[PDB]
Design a protein around this motif. Structure first.
Motif, PDB file in Angstrom:
ATOM      1  N   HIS A 145      -9.329   6.412   5.049  1.00 31.76           N
ATOM      2  CA  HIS A 145      -9.589   6.315   3.619  1.00 31.76           C
ATOM      3  C   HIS A 145      -9.578   7.721   3.064  1.00 31.76           C
ATOM      4  N   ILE A 146      -8.631   8.009   2.192  1.00 33.85           N
ATOM      5  CA  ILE A 146      -8.500   9.350   1.641  1.00 33.85           C
ATOM      6  C   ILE A 146      -9.060   9.345   0.226  1.00 33.85           C
ATOM      7  N   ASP A 147      -9.924  10.313  -0.068  1.00 36.57           N
ATOM      8  CA  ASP A 147     -10.553  10.402  -1.383  1.00 36.57           C
ATOM      9  C   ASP A 147      -9.582  11.123  -2.316  1.00 36.57           C
ATOM     10  N   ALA A 148      -8.469  10.445  -2.588  1.00 34.50           N
ATOM     11  CA  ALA A 148      -7.410  10.964  -3.447  1.00 34.50           C
ATOM     12  C   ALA A 148      -7.152   9.967  -4.568  1.00 34.50           C
ATOM     13  N   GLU A 149      -7.279  10.430  -5.818  1.00 28.90           N
ATOM     14  CA  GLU A 149      -7.027   9.616  -7.013  1.00 28.90           C
ATOM     15  C   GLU A 149      -5.542   9.716  -7.307  1.00 28.90           C
ATOM     16  N   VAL A 150      -4.801   8.676  -6.961  1.00 30.22           N
ATOM     17  CA  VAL A 150      -3.357   8.709  -7.084  1.00 30.22           C
ATOM     18  C   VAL A 150      -2.870   7.301  -7.391  1.00 30.22           C
ATOM     19  N   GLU A 151      -1.781   7.225  -8.155  1.00 32.67           N
ATOM     20  CA  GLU A 151      -1.102   5.973  -8.440  1.00 32.67           C
ATOM     21  C   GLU A 151       0.037   5.755  -7.449  1.00 32.67           C
ATOM     22  N   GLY A 152       0.351   4.491  -7.215  1.00 33.65           N
ATOM     23  CA  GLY A 152       1.476   4.150  -6.372  1.00 33.65           C
ATOM     24  C   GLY A 152       1.810   2.691  -6.558  1.00 33.65           C
ATOM     25  N   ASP A 153       3.052   2.345  -6.222  1.00 34.17           N
ATOM     26  CA  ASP A 153       3.427   0.941  -6.320  1.00 34.17           C
ATOM     27  C   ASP A 153       3.032   0.153  -5.079  1.00 34.17           C
ATOM     28  N   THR A 154       2.943   0.809  -3.923  1.00 32.60           N
ATOM     29  CA  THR A 154       2.688   0.136  -2.653  1.00 32.60           C
ATOM     30  C   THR A 154       1.231   0.300  -2.248  1.00 32.60           C
ATOM     31  N   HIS A 155       0.609  -0.803  -1.843  1.00 38.50           N
ATOM     32  CA  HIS A 155      -0.801  -0.846  -1.495  1.00 38.50           C
ATOM     33  C   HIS A 155      -0.981  -1.583  -0.173  1.00 38.50           C
ATOM     34  N   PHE A 156      -1.988  -1.157   0.592  1.00 37.78           N
ATOM     35  CA  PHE A 156      -2.409  -1.903   1.774  1.00 37.78           C
ATOM     36  C   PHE A 156      -2.896  -3.293   1.351  1.00 37.78           C
ATOM     37  N   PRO A 157      -2.684  -4.322   2.177  1.00 39.26           N
ATOM     38  CA  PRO A 157      -3.132  -5.666   1.784  1.00 39.26           C
ATOM     39  C   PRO A 157      -4.631  -5.708   1.620  1.00 39.26           C
ATOM     40  N   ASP A 158      -5.067  -6.575   0.717  1.00 36.11           N
ATOM     41  CA  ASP A 158      -6.485  -6.792   0.468  1.00 36.11           C
ATOM     42  C   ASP A 158      -7.090  -7.492   1.686  1.00 36.11           C
ATOM     43  N   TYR A 159      -7.760  -6.740   2.567  1.00 40.21           N
ATOM     44  CA  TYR A 159      -8.326  -7.334   3.775  1.00 40.21           C
ATOM     45  C   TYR A 159      -9.718  -7.860   3.486  1.00 40.21           C
ATOM     46  N   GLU A 160      -9.933  -9.106   3.852  1.00 40.91           N
ATOM     47  CA  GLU A 160     -11.168  -9.793   3.560  1.00 40.91           C
ATOM     48  C   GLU A 160     -12.329  -9.102   4.256  1.00 40.91           C
ATOM     49  N   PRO A 161     -13.321  -8.611   3.524  1.00 41.02           N
ATOM     50  CA  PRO A 161     -14.561  -8.138   4.168  1.00 41.02           C
ATOM     51  C   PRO A 161     -15.227  -9.172   5.070  1.00 41.02           C
ATOM     52  N   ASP A 162     -15.166 -10.457   4.701  1.00 40.36           N
ATOM     53  CA  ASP A 162     -15.741 -11.544   5.488  1.00 40.36           C
ATOM     54  C   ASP A 162     -15.045 -11.734   6.826  1.00 40.36           C
ATOM     55  N   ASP A 163     -13.849 -11.203   6.969  1.00 44.93           N
ATOM     56  CA  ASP A 163     -13.048 -11.419   8.156  1.00 44.93           C
ATOM     57  C   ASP A 163     -13.031 -10.222   9.078  1.00 44.93           C
ATOM     58  N   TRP A 164     -13.627  -9.106   8.675  1.00 48.46           N
ATOM     59  CA  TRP A 164     -13.428  -7.850   9.380  1.00 48.46           C
ATOM     60  C   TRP A 164     -14.771  -7.167   9.580  1.00 48.46           C
ATOM     61  N   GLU A 165     -15.000  -6.684  10.784  1.00 47.99           N
ATOM     62  CA  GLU A 165     -16.216  -5.963  11.128  1.00 47.99           C
ATOM     63  C   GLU A 165     -15.872  -4.507  11.367  1.00 47.99           C
ATOM     64  N   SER A 166     -16.566  -3.604  10.683  1.00 46.84           N
ATOM     65  CA  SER A 166     -16.356  -2.184  10.938  1.00 46.84           C
ATOM     66  C   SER A 166     -17.027  -1.814  12.254  1.00 46.84           C
ATOM     67  N   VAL A 167     -16.279  -1.214  13.177  1.00 45.87           N
ATOM     68  CA  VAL A 167     -16.830  -0.844  14.475  1.00 45.87           C
ATOM     69  C   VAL A 167     -16.831   0.655  14.705  1.00 45.87           C
ATOM     70  N   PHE A 168     -16.264   1.428  13.790  1.00 49.57           N
ATOM     71  CA  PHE A 168     -16.220   2.872  13.918  1.00 49.57           C
ATOM     72  C   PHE A 168     -15.949   3.434  12.533  1.00 49.57           C
ATOM     73  N   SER A 169     -16.660   4.501  12.193  1.00 49.31           N
ATOM     74  CA  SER A 169     -16.516   5.157  10.901  1.00 49.31           C
ATOM     75  C   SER A 169     -16.878   6.625  11.082  1.00 49.31           C
ATOM     76  N   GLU A 170     -16.059   7.528  10.555  1.00 45.50           N
ATOM     77  CA  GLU A 170     -16.398   8.947  10.612  1.00 45.50           C
ATOM     78  C   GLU A 170     -15.896   9.623   9.351  1.00 45.50           C
ATOM     79  N   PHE A 171     -16.826  10.138   8.566  1.00 45.26           N
ATOM     80  CA  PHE A 171     -16.498  10.790   7.317  1.00 45.26           C
ATOM     81  C   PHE A 171     -16.290  12.276   7.564  1.00 45.26           C
ATOM     82  N   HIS A 172     -15.312  12.857   6.868  1.00 43.34           N
ATOM     83  CA  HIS A 172     -14.989  14.274   6.965  1.00 43.34           C
ATOM     84  C   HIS A 172     -14.860  14.833   5.564  1.00 43.34           C
ATOM     85  N   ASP A 173     -15.566  15.924   5.287  1.00 43.76           N
ATOM     86  CA  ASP A 173     -15.343  16.631   4.035  1.00 43.76           C
ATOM     87  C   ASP A 173     -13.985  17.331   4.052  1.00 43.76           C
ATOM     88  N   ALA A 174     -13.474  17.619   2.853  1.00 44.31           N
ATOM     89  CA  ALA A 174     -12.325  18.504   2.720  1.00 44.31           C
ATOM     90  C   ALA A 174     -12.594  19.809   3.457  1.00 44.31           C
TER      91      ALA A 174
END
Ligand SMILES: NC(=O)c1ccc[n+]([C@@H]2O[C@H](COP(=O)([O-])OP(=O)(O)OC[C@H]3O[C@@H](n4cnc5c(N)ncnc54)[C@H](OP(=O)(O)O)[C@@H]3O)[C@@H](O)[C@H]2O)c1
Ligand SMILES: Nc1nc(=O)c2nc(CNc3ccc(C(=O)N[C@@H](CCC(=O)O)C(=O)O)cc3)cnc2[nH]1
Length: 160
Positions: free
Chosen positions: A115-144
């Motif tokens: 997940h990139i903290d970039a405010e940008v427009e585009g025509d192509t997007h990742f599919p809307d993945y259901e939160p109800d269907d997906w479990e986060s098992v790893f997360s690591e945030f990095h500052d610029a």
């Protein structure tokens, strides 16, 4: 065999703007390489054209309704043929783009997302993945930092 999607997402789950990535995150290309090396990679013909050369150390499988135009890669005409062309491997990596991610999301058991903290427009997007269907098992945030102009978060989700 297990299917995983790997994608870099900006705001709006944007993944593409005019055939190329509209932002830049160098840290993400180590993450992408780390998580795809020595695995088959399925991609749509537009994503193949954006990379210009087979991803080395990976079996490259290219979805296209037309005959193949490069013998360094494996050409296939459907989602199921693309999966079959990967053979019996522990994990197939689907590496985009928008059209291919949409088709493979219902088949996938894992998502590798940046997940990139970039405010940008585009025509192509990742599919809307259901939160109800997906479990986060790893997360690591990095500052610029001095190499990455945006903060970013590496995530892995597993299908419920
Ligand atoms: N940020 C990321 O994580 C990421 C990852 C990759 C790409 N991208 C971006 O996403 C955008 C490209 O995604 P895209 O949706 O434009 O194109 P794409 O999904 O890369 O490839 C689309 C093409 O693949 C073929 N295809 C896909 N599914 C097929 C099927 N089931 N059967 C037969 N052929 C099939 C067709 O080619 P024919 O017309 O030859 O039949 C279709 O026109 C670009 O902007 C790229 O930079 C971003
Ligand atoms: N998850 C994901 N993140 C991305 O940033 C991404 N980018 C592209 C398109 N961008 C590119 C452009 C060039 C190279 C490239 O030159 N490949 C080299 C180095 C790649 C790297 O830095 O890891 C190679 O390994 O041959 C790769 C991806 C396609 N799928 C993606 N998928």
């Amino acid at each position: 065999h297990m299917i995983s999607l790997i994608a870099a997402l900006a705001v709006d789950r944007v993944i593409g703007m005019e055939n190329a990535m509209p932002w830049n995150l160098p840290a993400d290309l180590a993450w992408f390489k780390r998580n795809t090396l020595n695995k088959p990679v399925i991609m749509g013909r537009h994503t193949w054209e954006s990379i210009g050369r087979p991803l080395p150390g990976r079996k490259n499988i290219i979805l296209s309704s037309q005959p193949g135009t490069d013998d360094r890669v494996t050409w296939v005409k459907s989602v199921d043929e693309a999966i079959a062309a990967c053979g019996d491997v522990p994990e197939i990596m689907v590496i985009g783009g928008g059209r291919v991610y949409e088709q493979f999301l219902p088949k996938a058991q894992k998502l590798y997302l940046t997940h990139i903290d970039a405010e940008v427009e585009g025509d192509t997007h990742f599919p809307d993945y259901e939160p109800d269907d997906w479990e986060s098992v790893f997360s690591e945030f990095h500052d610029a930092d001095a190499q990455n102009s945006h903060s970013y978060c590496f995530e892995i989700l597993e299908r419920r």
